[PDB]
Subunit: 343 residues, 4 copies
């Protein structure tokens, strides 16, 4: 089928499958897996940080970072529509015993003044604000790119207050491709960055957290506690190395396909805004259709297209390596036929 549900569905490339088969492994608990070690070295180097830590998921990456940055009772400033707040099972409260302090943002960009204002003064009644999280290519807003200036401004505020900064960079490479800002530049304004290998980069499993050596050591212990301490994970790291070093540039193709898809959907008559498509995501409203988002998703599936409804009136279409231009053209033929039926 044509899977436009998310970039998480990407499958390993032939190069990855071969590398996994001949991957040199060792027990990572003893720090003896050579491939995991190289992946972490490469990740650190790539983001200009002192160290890196491989994790089974982006969620664990964010959570071990929060654990390594905070103490029980602390407060974490984050954007009101960020993944850490909405889609991580309330892990920050259970695992770290910290409270989120949602701050509204415009497509992932929290007004620096609102962030500064959300910082807690020192008083016995108040939690200590110890961390500020920023999500780049903010998902809920539709894969929008947070301006480098916004991140720089917030980094300055954090510095003045002695507050740590964490960038949820699950799709930071998509941000870099769209903005032209090198990932090292983003990373420089943060204490830690979590980036996914299993989404647009096509690795089957995992993410990586990069930051200072002491922070990473604390995160590695947190990883052990959470259950992310694997044995011969070099098999996964082999695909991870290829994802990090050879699958970044082509993300531009996903962006081009998403824009093309949006432009053509608008032409057909669907409620989409091509001008809002900055990375690999397209938001499709169903207000003008005879069935709502849930009913339309079912019609799409029957015709060979997979997508998710994010509300009763919205569907999200996401492009990635396993959605070629031919697939986009085929999907458009299907959307054309369904518009005749459901408009």
């Amino acid at each position: 089928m044509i899977d436009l549900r998310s970039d998480t569905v990407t499958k390993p490339t032939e190069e990855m499958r071969k590398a996994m088969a001949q991957a040199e492994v060792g027990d990572d608990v003893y720090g003896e897996d050579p491939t995991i070690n190289e992946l972490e070295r490469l990740a650190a180097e790539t983001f200009g940080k002192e160290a890196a830590l491989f994790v089974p998921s982006g969620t664990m990456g964010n959570q071990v970072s929060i654990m390594a940055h905070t103490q029980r009772g602390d407060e974490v400033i984050l954007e009101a529509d960020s993944h850490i707040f909405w889609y991580e099972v309330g892990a920050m409260a259970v695992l770290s015993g910290v409270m989120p302090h949602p701050v509204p943002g415009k497509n992932g960009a929290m007004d620096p003044d609102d962030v500064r204002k959300a910082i807690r003064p020192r008083n016995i009644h108040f939690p200590r604000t110890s961390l500020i999280a920023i999500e780049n290519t903010h998902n809920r807003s539709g894969g929008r790119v947070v301006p480098l200036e916004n991140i720089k401004e917030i980094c300055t505020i954090a510095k003045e207050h002695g507050i740590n900064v964490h960038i949820d960079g699950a799709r930071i490479f998509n941000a870099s491709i769209a903005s032209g800002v090198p990932v090292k530049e983003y990373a420089g304004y943060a204490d830690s960055v979590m980036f996914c290998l299993s989404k647009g980069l096509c690795a089957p499993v995992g993410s990586v957290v990069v930051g200072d050596r002491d922070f990473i050591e604390r995160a590695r212990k947190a990883r052990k506690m959470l259950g992310g301490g694997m044995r011969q994970a070099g098999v996964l790291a082999a695909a991870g190395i290829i994802a990090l070093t050879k699958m970044v540039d082509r993300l531009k193709e996903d962006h081009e396909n998403a824009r093309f898809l949006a432009l053509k959907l608008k032409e057909i008559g669907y409620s989409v805004n091509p001008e809002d498509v900055k990375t690999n995501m397209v938001i499709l409203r169903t207000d003008n259709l005879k069935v709502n988002a849930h009913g339309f998703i079912e019609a799409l599936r029957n015709s060979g297209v997979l997508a998710n409804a994010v509300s009763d009136t919205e569907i999200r279409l996401v492009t990635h390596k396993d959605v070629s231009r031919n697939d986009i053209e085929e999907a458009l033929n299907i959307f054309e036929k369904l518009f005749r039926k459901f408009s």
Copy 2:
């Protein structure tokens, strides 16, 4: 001094001091303190609930209620400027491992539709919404009365979804006096209610939580875990009974004094809204002054008036039994003089 910082500064009445001296006591851990037992019996009766639990503070009252209503990883819907979120040291995250889900409100009144939208659907990525908290006479907005209709609507939504409702009624009697709604009526739309004895009611220590027998049993065990299980606490309960049974009616005097204070401050030229003052609080804005809230608080202190800044531009003035009309008149003379200096 003329202490307008909070109604918590109220000192025991002569009748309270004597009652504490002759209080009949016992070991509360064994449930043998007769005065604590009578206080809880009286509180439950007054609020139309099955049981009650005495606690050393309102913070503990709120926190044991959250513990008794939730499980780790749950989410708690509460108003964005509520005390549980801002002034309770992030306790909900540490003690219950729950995540707050802030919802904007108009003077403490969360739009029922927004509350409905904040409820989490059943999905692996989401925490379970198990509690909705409403604060009556919302502190931050200026001791504002939450409309009974608001509470009724939210109660209905909660019932629909099988969600618990907790009323932070620290100043519920102030609300009752101003609105004319009996506290028993407010309580009927909630599963639990925490009310303070140590604020406007003048008791030196404590609050009480009322609710169903099984919930109170869970709250009592939580109280033991938190360290609120005292011994001969009947000494405190003696004053509590008097606070509950003899100090409710006179709260009207505090409301009169607060309104008078606000009216006269407006005439002087200060940025206050007398029409918004319905209970014992007055929010004073410093945007039209030469110094901010922190600087003005210091000036007030030097002239005999104590108050707290609640932001860089807002000051909260609170009236209570230990601030007479004469004290208010004296404070106004001071405010008058300071307007000449800082306007």
Copy 3:
């Protein structure tokens, strides 16, 4: 009835009742209650520490100390039969996220070598041992006194490893009176000490934690989070000052009464060991009786004597101010009758 269940049942003396009624108070949240302030000053001075914190219960005292001494995932070494492990509702795990590391002891004295062995090496699999707790006049062993030499040796081990030491001194004054070791000497070999005012010292409510200024500041914030931040608690502190300054010497009377009780029970034929009784507790075994401990407790209750079973073959008898020699004599007459019935 004749209450030998615990020393927690002690009621206020007339002097205490008068002091509570005339207590000079203030709002403790602002650090303005003069009596709480003097109690803390006196407590610190008496224990030779720079700071102190009044709390509603010994449980809260121990728990805020644990919170202030540890970080999530840490381990706390403690005696296998200590109160923090057995009678504090699993609070250490919930509030501080720490693991208890039980170490056997002989009448409360953990072998220093066993303590050194229980300290965790630096390994990713292990929690960090950050606290060692010692209970003085160890309850479960029968109110036994831990030798100063034991505490001194453990203190040295702790210093070598940079580990904190907390003394659960709920009954530290009983230990001091029996041993001749001043409480400031026990405390000199510890970082913090919690002692109760509501047991043998006869105050109706509360305990105090003593320690260094920074530690107490953290413990004070923990107290706020837990709900121990009261307002005009000076009413309680007034009785607390009398407990600390005037009720310590008479503890020798409780020790004398416990010894007399034990000697006479032995004379009757009960299985008691007068040689093990050095403070205010007597352990009686039901080994030579035709009933178990629980059945014996019931028989005692029906005859006018209250006590607690601590196992299926052992019951604990505790003396205090409210069980006079006359009461011990009357209890013995009852014990004599019951011995003929169940022996």
Copy 4:
């Protein structure tokens, strides 16, 4: 290279596993669409006679999501005093679940049922609620000892009477089964949940599996999401797991035979070992009759080409597995014999 007797965790993937992983049919596990993970879980559930199963990245996560699914904050978990959950899991039970461990000493990993019964908390405001009893099969610290089925049966009876959940940390449950002749489904029949490792003696590179009832597994799956174990195309790992479960269990007998040989021969040399206690893949060696300590002996072994771990200042643990052959054992023994001359 060196003879690695440190642990069975160092086992490397077999040729068949490597090919199956690289060519694995995958899908997004978050959507429950990875076919290989689904088959691994189906097979695991079937093997243990349970309704459902959950793949996890580590045995630690397997145990922790089980504790989370079985308990509520403030609860107490009865477990053996020297069990892995208490000693080697970073205090996770306290941080993640807010529960207190209630250590019960055991005899060769087996807790006396009456001691377990006595450890259950009475209902009292001062006491946490006992909601879970955990049993470790082939108890590691005691030397990979096999807990009798009757011990587990008796504890199950006590738990049922009290309405308490039972979890078996079966990291090496297949080693227990091969040695005892007891099918793993029989051990599991007396438990609510069982966690077993695929990455130790079974030779898979990564992961473990938790088995149990449908509702419990659903709760454990949500816990797994919270802890960060919700992976995407994990079928790559599951492919090796299927082979571990289907083709690597029987040969564990070889690891046991190698460990028995090692123990018998070490005894013959003069080392303080008890061949009579060796029934699975572990040998405990005490350094009581050596002029060196445990850590010093480990260093000496390293210098001679043998890798082992000290588990006490006087105890070393030797573990056999697929990657240590009989010839490797003979080599280690010949070295042990000489080092006995130097340190005795």
